């Protein structure tokens, strides 16, 4: 085959350095087209003789004099004549056919002039539109991740083909130009038209194309100079900056950078750090080296209207991107098949960095609910996949995009955290530093990190492993899934097997290891840490560490550092339960949660009865801390979803009202009648969940608090008396208790809300009305652009659907208005998969299945488009719900009746 028909670049030519000049035109032409122009020179070195230059180019028109490029030799090298230049669209190449061969060791310069659309598409150099007062503003910014650098200028657009870049922006003279590096100096006027200015930037270090960034805008900054002279700036809309919304980001950035320089034993490798808040940046955040982009709600924080979870989100998303400024940007994985190592690593250490900035918050705990249990839901499926993918199976831009998923990020994080824990952090940090120093400004595979970690292991005598780092990690990276570890405490027998939530699932993906792992197993016996154990690649083993007397108990996987779930014989479970009932503080808070998370998953898998899982919630009446309650609430939301229209609900509600009342009472006092929030994040999180659980389960005292506060707000609209933390519950419950007075007031507040996060809470709360007529009127608003944003339409319908009373109304609304398909799937794709998912979520009867089939019977024209697969998922999901409800209804009913007094 011809090389220009292969998706991977040749290795015959390697880039040295680039000059790139970009010029966005932020005024459309007389047709509404926005464009940018560019000029580039790439200097590259011939490694092997070749008579063709293949470089990436996507959606660029060339206006170069002559052929699409001009080609020169560097110094006194001669250059062959160009035969022709062509664009090969499929593989996204510009191809320069030469009349002779380039010579090994010679350097060449290739110059081009080009232009592209400055589209509203979040790809390459693109435009972003937003409002300042009555004025529509347009800025130019970048998103190269993963294969879009080539959409802004021709380049060898693979991550290992690193080079230095000299960026120049030509821009309106009253706008600011930003790039990876500082400007060289002040801007100078463009001679052809001094309404434009030219900003040149300092040369980048040797770096990857996917990490380039350049931005032209009206933004302003808050700034700090670190003690080492590193300039730190947070950029945002002028009104956001003036409001002070960039201050929290500024506060944490300096401490995070310092943490990482030490953690990595490597100086921050750039002269400055810019971070920018972009309105409606749907990629969320991107780690461009020296110029990190964020969506506004991810970077900005308003103390007066934002909740604590909001603050947690800002500090961790910052730590994540900053983590990459070394791991990923300084040392770069050679190919997209190893993306998991890069994103998995940042997804783990974001908690470490953030913990440094907010050390009272215990942020490191949050990886357990946030990543470990989250990803275990999808990794406990037959349709999962290994972290590792052969490089030669990842070729196309679409294949590269598929690397960015939950497994890569969250299982990547879980597995790396497990690795650091079993090596110990000190030892892990030593291998990590060695890896970074050896490969700085270069590229690696995951085997390079293992090698450097093994070097650290081999240079000490304290930590001993049952095999090499690589052999151990191969079990966690070359095969999908994870084991359930089952202990029989009467014998100390211990077994492992591939855990699937569906006990009747057929696994057809084969493992080189037969789904056996090498497993690090910490344990606690009667509240005392035991010696660490390794389960080798065997189905069963035995150790006295896991053997108990019937007044003793043992509990494995302390703090859920290991990527596995744990089952015990029923006697040990009861002992654990007893301990949790009498003195819970003897079991680490994370394990108090684990008992709940694991047992509910085990019940789903038919490995324990559902009553055993429910039994594990009984201790919660004395539980004050966030996580174990969160575990219960996450595990029970499906029960609520299946049973909230059934006879099971009263007893469930009553049971939950019983469990949560003492916690509610506790915070009542602690908060001094809800006047002051608890001090640290976990306790604030616990209060939020307690209020939520209390109110939504009809605890009179909570309902009273909600009604009082909202009435107080209504009598004095400009002085909101509800703390941001509690708003979503208080607003929802108060609207639930009230009528059109409350609803119309909240709607008024929605229509004048300036801040997205307040508007979100209001939109969600309005769906909590218990008046059919208000909900139907609200549904009638969701398709009106004047009243509900397009981007918010399905979200709103979904919130209405989640109201038991709104369920039939939303479902009727969707069926009836479905012909908004030939209206929103040609103008703006309109997340239809989420809508179907949401409104059909509750379905658990044959009757509801029949409704869904009868509704589907409209394939005749219309179709479904983006949610065609989502409908099929809904039918499969309904069958699963039907079956689960039949198996569980009776047992669950009687357990709740039994335990609600």
């Amino acid at each position: 085959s011809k090389p220009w028909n292969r998706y991977r670049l040749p290795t015959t030519l390697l880039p040295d350095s680039y000059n790139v000049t970009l010029r966005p035109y932020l005024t459309p032409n007389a047709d509404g087209l926005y464009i940018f122009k560019g000029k580039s020179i790439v200097r590259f070195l011939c490694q092997e003789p070749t008579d063709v230059i293949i470089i990436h180019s996507k959606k660029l028109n060339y206006t170069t004099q002559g052929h699409m490029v001009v080609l020169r030799g560097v110094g006194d090298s001669q250059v062959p004549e160009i035969d022709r230049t062509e664009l090969v669209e499929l593989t996204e190449y510009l191809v320069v056919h030469l009349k002779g061969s380039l010579q090994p060791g010679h350097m060449y310069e290739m110059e081009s002039e080009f232009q592209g659309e400055l589209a509203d598409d979040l790809a390459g150099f693109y435009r972003s539109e937003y409002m300042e007062g009555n004025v529509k503003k347009v800025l130019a910014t970048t998103q190269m991740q993963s294969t879009d650098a080539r959409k802004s200028f021709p380049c060898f657009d693979e991550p290992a083909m690193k080079a230095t870049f000299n960026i120049t922006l030509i821009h309106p003279n009253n706008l600011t130009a930003l790039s990876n590096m500082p400007p060289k100096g002040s801007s100078t006027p463009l001679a052809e038209d001094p309404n434009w200015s030219v900003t040149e930037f300092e040369t980048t270090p040797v770096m990857s194309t996917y990490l380039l960034a350049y931005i032209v805008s009206e933004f302003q900054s808050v700034n700090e100079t670190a003690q080492n002279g590193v300039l730190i700036r947070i950029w945002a809309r002028p009104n956001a900056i003036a409001e002070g919304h960039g201050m929290y980001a500024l506060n944490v950035t300096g401490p995070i950078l310092n943490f990482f320089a030490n953690h990595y034993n490597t100086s921050y490798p750039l002269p400055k750090s810019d971070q920018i808040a972009l309105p409606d940046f749907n990629a969320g955040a991107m780690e461009n080296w020296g110029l990190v982009t964020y969506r506004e709600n991810a970077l900005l924080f308003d103390p007066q209207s934002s909740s604590i979870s909001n603050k947690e989100r800002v500090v961790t998303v910052i730590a994540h991107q900053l983590a990459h400024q070394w791991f990923g940007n300084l040392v770069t994985l050679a190919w997209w098949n190893d993306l998991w190592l890069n994103e998995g690593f940042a997804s783990y250490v974001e908690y470490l960095g953030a913990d440094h900035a907010e050390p009272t918050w215990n942020l490191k705990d949050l990886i357990v609910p946030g990543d470990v249990y989250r990803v275990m839901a999808v990794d406990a499926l037959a349709s999962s996949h290994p972290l590792t993918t052969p490089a030669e199976e990842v070729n196309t831009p679409a294949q590269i995009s598929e690397m960015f998923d939950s497994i890569s990020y969250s299982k990547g994080a879980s597995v790396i955290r497990m690795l650091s824990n079993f090596l110990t952090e000190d030892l892990f940090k030593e291998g990590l530093a060695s890896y970074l120093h050896a490969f700085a400004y270069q590229n690696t595979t995951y085997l390079d990190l293992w090698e450097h970690l093994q070097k650290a292991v081999d240079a000490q005598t304290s930590i001993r492993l049952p095999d090499t780092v690589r052999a151990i990690m191969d079990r966690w990276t070359l095969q999908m899934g994870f084991p359930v570890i089952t202990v029989d405490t009467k014998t100390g027998n211990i077994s492992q097997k591939h855990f699937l939530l569906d006990s009747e699932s057929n696994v057809t993906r084969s493992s080189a290891f037969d789904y056996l792992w090498i497993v690090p197993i910490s344990s606690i016996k009667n509240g005392v840490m035991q010696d660490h154990y390794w389960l080798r690649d065997v189905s069963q083993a035995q150790n006295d560490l896991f053997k108990t007397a019937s007044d003793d108990w043992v509990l494995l996987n302390v703090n859920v550092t290991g990527y596995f779930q744990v089952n015990y014989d029923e006697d040990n479970w009861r002992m654990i339960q007893h301990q949790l009932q009498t003195n819970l503080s003897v079991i680490p808070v994370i394990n108090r949660a684990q008992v709940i998370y694991d047992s509910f998953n085990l019940a789903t898998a038919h490995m324990v009865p559902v009553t055993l899982a429910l039994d594990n919630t009984l201790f919660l009446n004395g539980e004050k801390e966030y996580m174990p309650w969160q575990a219960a609430l996450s595990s029970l939301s499906y029960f609520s979803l299946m049973f909230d229209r059934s006879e099971v609900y009263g007893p469930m509600k009553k049971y939950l009202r019983k469990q949560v009342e003492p916690l509610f009472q506790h915070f009542e006092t602690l908060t001094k009648n809800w006047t002051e929030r608890p001090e640290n994040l976990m306790d604030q999180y616990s209060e939020i969940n307690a209020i939520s659980t209390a109110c939504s389960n009809g605890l009179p005292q909570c309902e009273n608090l909600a009604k009082t506060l909202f009435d107080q707000w209504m009598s004095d609209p400009e002085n909101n008396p509800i703390h941001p933390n509690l708003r979503s519950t208080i607003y929802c419950n108060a609207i639930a208790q009230g009528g059109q007075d409350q609803w119309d007031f909240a709607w008024g507040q929605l229509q004048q809300a300036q801040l997205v996060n307040e508007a979100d809470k209001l939109r969600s709360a309005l769906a909590c009305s218990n008046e059919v007529w208000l909900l139907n009127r609200y549904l009638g608003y969701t398709l009106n652009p004047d009243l509900i944003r397009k981007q918010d339409a399905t979200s709103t319908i979904n919130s209405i659907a989640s109201n038991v009373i709104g369920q039939p109304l939303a479902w009727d609304f969707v069926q009836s208005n479905w012909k908004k398909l030939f209206q929103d799937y040609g103008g703006g794709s309109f997340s239809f998969s989420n809508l179907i998912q949401g409104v059909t979520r509750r379905f658990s009867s044959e009757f509801e299945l029949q409704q869904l089939e009868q509704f589907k019977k409209n394939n005749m024209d219309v179709g479904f488009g983006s949610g065609t697969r989502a409908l099929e998922q809904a039918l499969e999901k309904t069958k699963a719900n039907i079956k689960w409800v039949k198996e569980n209804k009776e047992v669950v009913l009687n357990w709740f009746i039994e335990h609600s007094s």
């Binding site: 991740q145 990629a283 969320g284 955040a285 991107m286 780690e287 989100r313 961790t316 998303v317 994540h320 994103e343 940042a346 997804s347 974001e350 949050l366 990886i367 609910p369 946030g370 990543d371 989250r374 960015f404 990020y409 969250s410 994080a413 969160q630």
Partner: peptide
């Protein structure tokens, strides 16, 4: 891009 990773 991205992460964090909620709970």
């Amino acid at each position: 891009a991205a992460a964090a990773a909620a709970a």
